[PDB]
Each structure stands twice: as structure tokens, then as C-alpha cells.
Ligand binder design. Structure first.
Ligand SMILES: *[C@@H]1O[C@H](CO[C@@H]2O[C@@H](C)[C@@H](O)[C@@H](O)[C@@H]2O)[C@@H](O[C@@H]2O[C@H](CO)[C@@H](O)[C@H](O)[C@H]2NC(C)=O)[C@H](O)[C@H]1NC(C)=O
Ligand SMILES: *[C@@H]1O[C@H](CO)[C@@H](O[C@@H]2O[C@H](CO)[C@@H](O)[C@H](O)[C@H]2NC(C)=O)[C@H](O)[C@H]1NC(C)=O
Ligand SMILES: *[C@@H]1O[C@H](CO)[C@@H](O[C@@H]2O[C@H](CO)[C@@H](O)[C@H](O)[C@H]2NC(C)=O)[C@H](O)[C@H]1NC(C)=O
Ligand SMILES: *[C@@H]1O[C@H](CO)[C@@H](O[C@@H]2O[C@H](CO)[C@@H](O)[C@H](O)[C@H]2NC(C)=O)[C@H](O)[C@H]1NC(C)=O
Ligand SMILES: *[C@@H]1O[C@H](CO)[C@@H](O[C@@H]2O[C@H](CO)[C@@H](O)[C@H](O)[C@H]2NC(C)=O)[C@H](O)[C@H]1NC(C)=O
Ligand SMILES: *[C@@H]1O[C@H](CO)[C@@H](O[C@@H]2O[C@H](CO)[C@@H](O)[C@H](O)[C@H]2NC(C)=O)[C@H](O)[C@H]1NC(C)=O
Ligand SMILES: *[C@@H]1O[C@H](CO)[C@@H](O)[C@H](O)[C@H]1NC(C)=O
Ligand SMILES: *[C@@H]1O[C@H](CO)[C@@H](O)[C@H](O)[C@H]1NC(C)=O
Ligand SMILES: *[C@@H]1O[C@H](CO)[C@@H](O)[C@H](O)[C@H]1NC(C)=O
Ligand SMILES: *[C@@H]1O[C@H](CO)[C@@H](O)[C@H](O)[C@H]1NC(C)=O
Ligand SMILES: *[C@@H]1O[C@H](CO)[C@@H](O)[C@H](O)[C@H]1NC(C)=O
Ligand SMILES: *[C@@H]1O[C@H](CO)[C@@H](O)[C@H](O)[C@H]1NC(C)=O
Lengths: 116, 407, 187
């Protein structure tokens, strides 16, 4: 949250980046710094700070009387992983709040019904 | 009763996707420039790391939500310079190069609507990862891919196809045959243009869904105003309470202030996890709607719009997404007199994929979602058993077009 | 770990352990420090319980999604695009995992293409034939009919098309011939 007037100074929109060369190319994002910029280590080596690239770029020769038909298929196998459950841990409130004492239990009994 | 005419209808649907990121310091808010407060706060243990961890988790989740919703493609397509789409006018949704950004007329007409001091108390805001221009580019690429390929680009490579034949496939996917489109293409094009114009007019004069998020995230005012309260002390200014007393009598005042401000921070952080969970659920629903309405043709009733579904186009409102479902509804009906089976010579003739209507005297077989009577030939039906078990059956004759040629 | 580490903070008392408080000092003057400790530990327990509740709700939502995917991808074939993988869906197999499930998604997907020239109808003799469940494609001289997801060309006949109307209102149309195989066999 400061400007680069105050304390390799590539002034960003997200702040003041110090210690990273500014290149003109466009690669994929490794470290999401923010506001478009993304830093990475692959440039003998030094950290760089480039601008995002949304991907490749192509066009299709769309016309009023042109169609494209596939001629050969392939078969693919992918994976997807979904958590289902987690551990079942219970906590006894008296043994944690108090210890083995008794006056502690008598004082805790004044707070009504929290442990339950 | 069978329809005899149809009218296209375009309707919108507004969904929120993400909300403003926020990182809140838990030491500047409580203490400030003092140091006695910083020493007294250390006794409470790790009550100034958990809040920061939770808030950063929320911010990362917001970035995740936007990335999941909008990044459905890898290649970035481009509309061809050719603008021959068989009659439709996609010049209010496709991007306009004249504007500084690439937001189309509807996109910036929508950005005009929603309107998107605190910092010096330790409250800071963070900038989004995907700047708005990238989101606009994603939406434009999705639009171009949908227009020039239909759905094939959503399951592998992108395959070119004329748009009229794509609409023929869309009609053939909901029961109506394709000659129905190929006969009156001009009427459908005109209806589509009129519907788009009406939507443009409607949005140019609501967005409560995207405004409730802002009016709930701007919480910050309550957090700020929970600083001018004594909380049982004598004055809610640390720089004054340490300039009118001594440590042994200032410690209790400082401690009361610490307790109050810690409770306020805990309440704020607790509320901004429930809000985050609700926003995440909405973003997941929006991602599903994109993936199924936009990159295909849905069959689930009343999922994408109201009526039958043809295609949809995405847009980009601030902190949300906007769809334009293109429905299909039938208009004009007529009474008739149906009959499940027509047995000719003791052989019932059930229809293949039609219905046996009659205009009073004759008997014609026609499809269900439209009206185009035909003659009851043999290739149009199929025999099954003898007509003595079918409940309601009327006795008539078939044509059998093989007869004339064999003479 | 954080819930455990909260058990070593004074919260304002002269020491963070209760046994020292109850051994070194007389209980009527120790009740205040005991109250301080109890308040701190109650705050910690409330925080932990609330955050665990939120995490449990999120895990429940994920488990419901996993159950739906198991019911639709595995025990049947789906058509919800990009639900059960990426591309057209053939089947899926389930595999267990520690506190989770892992799905394997066999998916059909097309490959190498070939440009073609199309037309939506065929004016044979004034009428206008239409493909039944195919698409008219021409390699450049002769017109064929093939399915829309795999190049397999067949000779256009009267058993692949059905007449509708006349060839003066369709925007695009091309003159061609229709085999009508009954006539050669009639002789
Ligand atoms: C398919 O699309 C175009 C057109 O090819 C022709 O399409 C019909 C009109 C018919 O006459 C076919 O027999 C022709 O093959 C071509 O796209 C070109 O792709 C190359 C790829 O390197 C590119 O350099 C050219 O600029 C493209 N041409 C145009 C006008 O865009 C090519 O034949 C096919 N394209 C692909 C990607 O397979
Ligand atoms: C597809 O579009 C092309 C034009 O891009 C049509 O070719 C002709 O192009 C000239 C260009 O000056 C136009 O004046 C003609 O009107 C076009 N022909 C027709 C029939 O409109 C081409 O014919 C189009 N093909 C189809 C099937 O409509
Ligand atoms: C479809 O693709 C498969 C795999 O690429 C082709 O099968 C190969 O064909 C080549 C040439 O005939 C053989 O040398 C290989 O042994 C085959 N198998 C593999 C695994 O490569 C198949 O021929 C293609 N079909 C068409 C019609 O192009
Ligand atoms: C089906 O409805 C459309 C309107 O949705 C009708 O189109 C109108 O037709 C009349 C003359 O028939 C024109 O004057 C209008 O300009 C057309 N458009 C509109 C919006 O009214 C169409 O005629 C109807 N078809 C049938 C068979 O009744
Ligand atoms: C139901 O539709 C048939 C369509 O064939 C009508 O048949 C017509 O009847 C008139 C009566 O004079 C003839 O002149 C026509 O040649 C017949 N065919 C056509 C295509 O019009 C029949 O009249 C209709 N029934 C009713 C009650 O309207
Ligand atoms: C386009 O398809 C036609 C129709 O098949 C081809 O014409 C004949 O094709 C068969 C094999 O399919 C050959 O055995 C014949 O010799 C072809 N006849 C002629 C006169 O060429 C045609 O070759 C295909 N290619 C082109 C460029 O037209
Ligand atoms: C930040 O510093 C740059 C470089 O001197 C200057 O151009 C810009 O106006 C400064 N911004 C602010 C808000 O002071
Ligand atoms: C990199 O971009 C900057 C800003 O546009 C420009 O001044 C500079 O000349 C560019 N350098 C190269 C090597 O392209
Ligand atoms: C599309 O509509 C705009 C606005 O009415 C108009 O300027 C443009 O000419 C139209 N394009 C076509 C192809 O009709
Ligand atoms: C069909 O008949 C009923 C009963 O008279 C009538 O109410 C209805 O309007 C008729 N339908 C049409 C399309 O005329
Ligand atoms: C059923 O068909 C027979 C022809 O064998 C005809 O005599 C009879 O009238 C038909 N049924 C009715 C209700 O008209
Ligand atoms: C087809 O033939 C008709 C005359 O039989 C002719 O007028 C027309 O130009 C031809 N070509 C078409 C319809 O594309």
C-alpha cells in the first residue's frame, strides 16, 4: 500500500515490487502477485515479473458453405478427486477448561449450559 | 391441442460470483502507534494470527471462484472479419473495437448501472487477480467459439459450421424437424433481432442481486464505528488514557478497551465466513450454468430460462455474470380429435413418432410440437397385433404407396 | 494444534497453570484469577467449535456432490456437458481413497478433421430432400451423406431423405440426383 517514491523498481498497480526484472513476453502464471502481474523464476537465473497471457490465439475459417468432419477417434482417461469426510474428534469441556480441581468446577457451574 | 406458430424470446439471469477481497490488520486496529497496548495484547496468545489466516483464505477462495467460473477455455478464438450469419445481427453482444476497453454495448451499458478514509485505521483492500479486461476477453472468446462452432469446441478441437445449420441442429434437438426452420428463416431472424433490441432497451432504464452484495460488504462502517465506545472505560482514546494516568491505573482501562475491540474483530471475522460460503455456493452454480447452457444444449426443464432451450450468451457485470437465454415457445393452438390406433384390416397401426389427429372428417398423422398434416402411409406407421384390445380405436384405411408403381 | 497451544496463556492472571494458583495462594483471593482463566478458555473453545462447524458444512456439501457424481456417472451414462469428465462420456469407474473418492473417466473425443462443402437441401425434381439424421457433404464433385460425428459417406438415395415443400424458398440449395433404388430392381 505505498508508492515507489518512498522506500530494479518495477512500479506495479498492486504496489512497489523490488528485486525483479520486468520482461516484455507473456507466459503462464506461477506466483499470482495480483492485478494481472505474475512472477516466476524461469528467465544466470533471476526472478522476473511479466504480464499474464490468457492462452494461445487462433481463428476458424467460418464460411456459409464450409463444414469440418472428424475422421478418427481417440480414447482418454482422466481423474477427479473429492473429499467425503474427516476425523471425528470430540472434546470434553470440563477437562480442558478446568483440570482435576474442584473449585474450578464449582466456578464453571455458574456459567449455566455451555459445555452441553 | 397442437400449436401452429412459434415465437423466440430472450430473457436474462443475474448471478453473483465473487465479492471484494479484504485483509484486516489485528494490531493497528486495536493498539495503533502505542506500545503499551502491544505489550498488553501479547498475553492473549495467538489471537492476532488466526484472523489474518482466515481472511487470506477467504481472499484466495475469491480468486479461485473467479478462475473456476470464467476459465472454461484454453484457446482464445476471434470472430472472423466476415459478418455473414444468415440473418441474425450479433452487433450488440460482440465487442466493439472503438471503445477503450473491449466491452460491448450491453457490457458497458451494464457497468454503468452498478456503482462500486477507512485505511488509516488499519483496514486495507486488495486488488483482484484477473483485471476486468481479461474477463471481457474470456467472454468474447466464449461468444466467438459458440457462434462459429456451436458446441464442438467444448469437447476437443473447434469445428467450423454455418450458423443456419447449427440452428437446424438446435431445433432437431427439441423434437421439431429442420424443414420448419429452413422454410421461415427470415421470421426467426427478425424475432431474434427484436428480442435482443427489447432486452437492450430494458437494461437501459433490475440488479438487486449484485447490489445486495455491495450493500452488505459496505460491515466495514460498523467495524469502524466500533471504536468511539468507552466499553466501560473513561475515554475511547489510548493516546489520552496514557496521557492522564500511570501504568498501575491505566492497565485496567487499556484491558477493557482490548477486550471490547477483540470482541468486535471476532464478530466481524465470523460474519465474513458465512458470507463467503454463500458466495462460493452461488459461484459454483454459475459455473455449472455456464458449462451446461453455454457449451451445449440443456434438457433439464427450466434450468436455462423458461420454455425450451436453444443457446445462451454470457456477459460480465461487475462482480458477477449475466446470461441471455434464447428460449422457444409455441403460440397458437387448435382443437382436434385424436385416436391412439388406426386398424385397417384387423391390424392395428400405431404411429411411429407422430400423432393421429383429424380435422373433423379425414385422418392425418402429424408431429407433436408443430402442425404439418400428412397422409397415413405404411412407412409412417408400424403394425402390432390385431385391433381388439386397444381401448379407443377408430376404423379407417392406410395408403400403402407401393401400389401405383407396380401397375 | 492451535487449540492446544492456547493452554499456556495467562489472559491476565499471574501464571498460566491452575495448580500453581491453587497451591501458592488462598482460594478466596484466587477466585478472580480462576475466573480470568475460565473466561479465556471458554473463548478459545467457542472459536474452535464455530470454525469446525463451518468446515463440516463445507465437507458435507462436497460429499453430496460426490454422491451425485457416483449416482449419475457410474450407474448410467450422462449427457450433462463437462460433468463426468471432459468430452463425450462412455463410463466411469470408482476407486477408494483415504477420506475421499477417486473417479476414472473414460471419454470419447474426436481427432483429425477434413474440410468439406455442405448444403442444407437437394432439389431433385422441384421437390427438396432433407437428410434424416445426417449432413450433406461434397468432396468437390459428387454429393454424399454422412453422420455428423464421424466421416462415413454413403450414396444418397430415397431412404436417407424425406421430401418437404418445393425448391424455391430454401436459401441454399443445389441441384443433384436421387437414386431411388426400387426402379432398377423393378425390371
Ligand atoms: C480448412 O479451412 C480452410 C479452408 O479450406 C478449404 O475449405 C473449403 C472451402 C474447401 O475448398 C476445402 O477443400 C479447402 O481445404 C483452410 O484453413 C487454412 O488453414 C491454414 C493452416 O495453416 C492457414 O494458414 C490458412 O490461413 C487457412 N485459410 C483460411 C482461409 O483461413 C484449410 O483448408 C483448412 N484449415 C484447417 C485448420 O484445417
Ligand atoms: C457465401 O457468401 C459469398 C460471399 O462472401 C457468396 O458469394 C457471392 O459473393 C459476391 C461478392 O460480391 C456477392 O455479391 C454475391 O451475392 C454472393 N453470392 C450469392 C449467391 O449471394 C456465396 O454465394 C455465398 N454462398 C451461399 C450458399 O450463400
Ligand atoms: C487412427 O489413429 C490410429 C492411431 O494413431 C491409427 O492406428 C495406427 O495406424 C498406423 C498406420 O496405419 C500404424 O502404423 C499404427 O500401428 C496404428 N496404431 C497406432 C497405435 O498408432 C489408425 O490408422 C488411424 N485411422 C485412420 C483412418 O486414420
Ligand atoms: C406467427 O407469428 C408471427 C409473429 O410472431 C407472425 O409474423 C407476422 O406476420 C404478419 C403477417 O402475417 C406481419 O405483418 C408481421 O410483421 C409479422 N411479425 C409480427 C411480429 O407480427 C406470423 O404471421 C405468424 N404465422 C402464422 C401462420 O400465423
Ligand atoms: C380436412 O382437410 C382436408 C384436406 O384434404 C379437406 O379436404 C378437402 O375437401 C374439400 C371439400 O370440397 C376439397 O375441395 C379439397 O380438394 C380437399 N382437399 C384439400 C387439400 O383441400 C377437408 O375438407 C377438411 N375437413 C374440414 C371439415 O375442413
Ligand atoms: C470425389 O468423390 C467422387 C465420388 O466417389 C470420386 O469419383 C469417383 O470416386 C471413386 C472412388 O470413390 C473412384 O473409383 C472413381 O474413379 C472416381 N471417378 C472419377 C471420374 O474420378 C472423386 O474421385 C472424388 N474426388 C474428387 C476430387 O472429385
Ligand atoms: C507515485 O510515484 C510516481 C513516480 O514518481 C508518480 O508519477 C505518481 O504520481 C505517484 N503517485 C502518487 C499517488 O503519489
Ligand atoms: C519492452 O516494452 C517497453 C514498453 O512498451 C518498450 O519501451 C521497450 O522498448 C520494449 N523492449 C523490447 C526489447 O521489446
Ligand atoms: C444491426 O443493428 C444495428 C443497430 O440497429 C445496425 O446499425 C446494423 O446495421 C445492424 N446490422 C445488420 C447486419 O442488420
Ligand atoms: C377447444 O374447445 C373448448 C371448449 O369449447 C374451448 O374452450 C377452447 O377455446 C377450444 N380451443 C380452441 C383453440 O379454440
Ligand atoms: C370397425 O371396422 C368394421 C370393418 O370391419 C366396421 O364394420 C365398423 O363399423 C368399424 N367400427 C365402427 C365403430 O364404425
Ligand atoms: C437448378 O436447375 C434450375 C432449373 O432446373 C435452375 O433454374 C437453377 O439455377 C439450378 N441451380 C440451382 C437451383 O442452384
Amino acid at each position: 500500500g505505498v508508492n515507489c517514491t518512498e522506500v530494479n523498481v518495477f512500479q506495479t498497480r498492486a504496489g512497489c515490487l523490488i528485486g525483479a526484472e520486468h520482461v516484455n513476453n507473456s507466459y503462464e502464471c506461477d506466483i499470482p502477485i495480483g492485478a494481472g502481474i505474475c512472477a516466476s523464476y524461469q528467465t544466470s537465473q533471476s526472478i522476473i515479473a511479466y504480464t499474464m497471457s490468457l492462452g494461445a490465439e487462433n481463428s476458424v475459417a467460418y464460411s456459409n458453405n464450409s463444414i469440418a468432419i472428424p475422421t478418427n477417434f481417440t480414447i482418454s482417461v482422466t481423474t477427479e478427486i473429492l473429499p467425503v469426510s474427516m476425523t471425528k474428534t470430540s472434546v470434553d469441556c470440563t477437562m480442558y477448561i478446568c483440570g482435576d480441581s474442584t473449585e474450578c468446577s464449582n466456578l464453571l457451574l455458574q456459567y449455566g449450559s455451555f459445555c452441553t | 391441442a397442437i400449436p401452429t406458430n412459434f415465437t423466440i424470446s430472450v430473457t436474462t439471469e443475474i448471478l453473483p460470483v465473487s465479492m471484494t477481497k479484504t485483509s484486516v490488520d489485528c494490531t493497528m486496529y486495536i493498539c495503533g502507534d502505542s506500545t503499551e497496548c502491544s505489550n498488553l495484547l501479547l498475553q492473549y496468545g495467538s489471537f492476532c494470527t488466526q484472523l489474518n489466516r482466515a481472511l487470506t483464505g477467504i481472499a484466495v477462495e475469491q480468486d479461485k471462484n473467479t478462475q473456476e467460473v470464467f476459465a472454461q477455455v484454453k484457446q482464445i478464438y476471434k470472430t472472423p472479419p466476415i459478418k455473414d450469419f444468415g440473418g441474425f445481427n450479433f452487433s450488440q453482444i460482440l465487442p466493439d473495437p472503438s471503445k477503450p476497453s473491449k466491452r460491448s454495448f450491453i457490457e458497458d451499458l451494464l457497468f454503468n448501472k452498478v456503482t462500486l478514509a477507512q485505511k488509516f485505521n488499519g483496514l486495507t483492500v486488495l486488488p483482484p487477480l484477473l483485471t476486468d479486461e481479461m474477463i471481457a476477453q474470456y467472454t468474447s472468446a466464449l461468444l466467438a467459439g459458440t457462434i462459429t462452432s456451436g458446441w464442438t469446441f467444448g469437447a476437443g478441437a473447434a469445428l467450423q459450421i454455418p450458423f443456419a445449420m447449427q440452428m437446424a441442429y438446435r431445433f432437431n434437438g427439441i423434437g421439431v424437424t429442420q424443414n420448419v426452420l429452413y422454410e421461415n428463416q427470415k421470421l426467426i431472424a427478425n424475432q431474434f433481432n427484436s428480442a435482443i433490441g427489447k432486452i437492450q432497451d430494458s437494461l437501459s432504464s433490475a440488479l438487486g442481486k449484485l447490489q445486495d452484495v455491495v450493500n452488505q460488504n459496505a460491515a466495514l462502517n460498523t467495524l469502524v464505528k466500533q471504536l468511539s465506545s468507552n466499553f466501560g472505560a473513561i475515554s475511547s482514546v489510548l493516546n489520552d488514557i496514557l496521557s492522564r494516568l500511570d501504568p498501575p491505573e491505566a492497565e485496567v482501562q487499556i484491558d477493557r478497551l482490548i477486550t471490547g475491540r477483540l470482541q468486535s474483530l471476532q464478530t466481524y471475522v465470523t460474519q465474513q465466513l458465512i458470507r463467503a460460503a454463500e458466495i462460493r455456493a452461488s459461484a459454483n452454480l454459475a459455473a455449472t450454468k455456464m458449462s451446461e447452457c453455454v457449451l451445449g444444449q440443456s434438457k433439464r426443464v427450466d434450468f436455462c430460462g423458461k420454455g425450451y432451450h436453444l443457446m445462451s450468451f454470457p456477459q460480465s457485470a461487475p462482480h458477477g455474470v449475466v446470461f441471455l437465454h434464447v428460449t422457444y415457445v409455441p403460440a397458437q393452438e387448435k382443437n382436434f380429435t385424436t385416436a391412439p390406433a388406426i386398424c385397417h384390416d384387423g391390424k392395428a397401426h400405431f404411429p411411429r413418432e407422430g400423432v393421429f389427429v383429424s380435422n373433423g372428417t379425414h385422418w392425418f398423422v402429424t408431429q407433436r410440437n408443430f402442425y404439418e398434416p400428412q397422409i397415413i402411409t405404411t412407412d409412417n406407421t408400424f403394425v402390432s397385433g390385431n385391433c381388439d384390445v386397444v381401448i379407443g380405436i377408430v376404423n379407417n384405411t392406410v395408403y400403402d404407396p407401393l401400389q401405383p408403381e407396380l401397375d
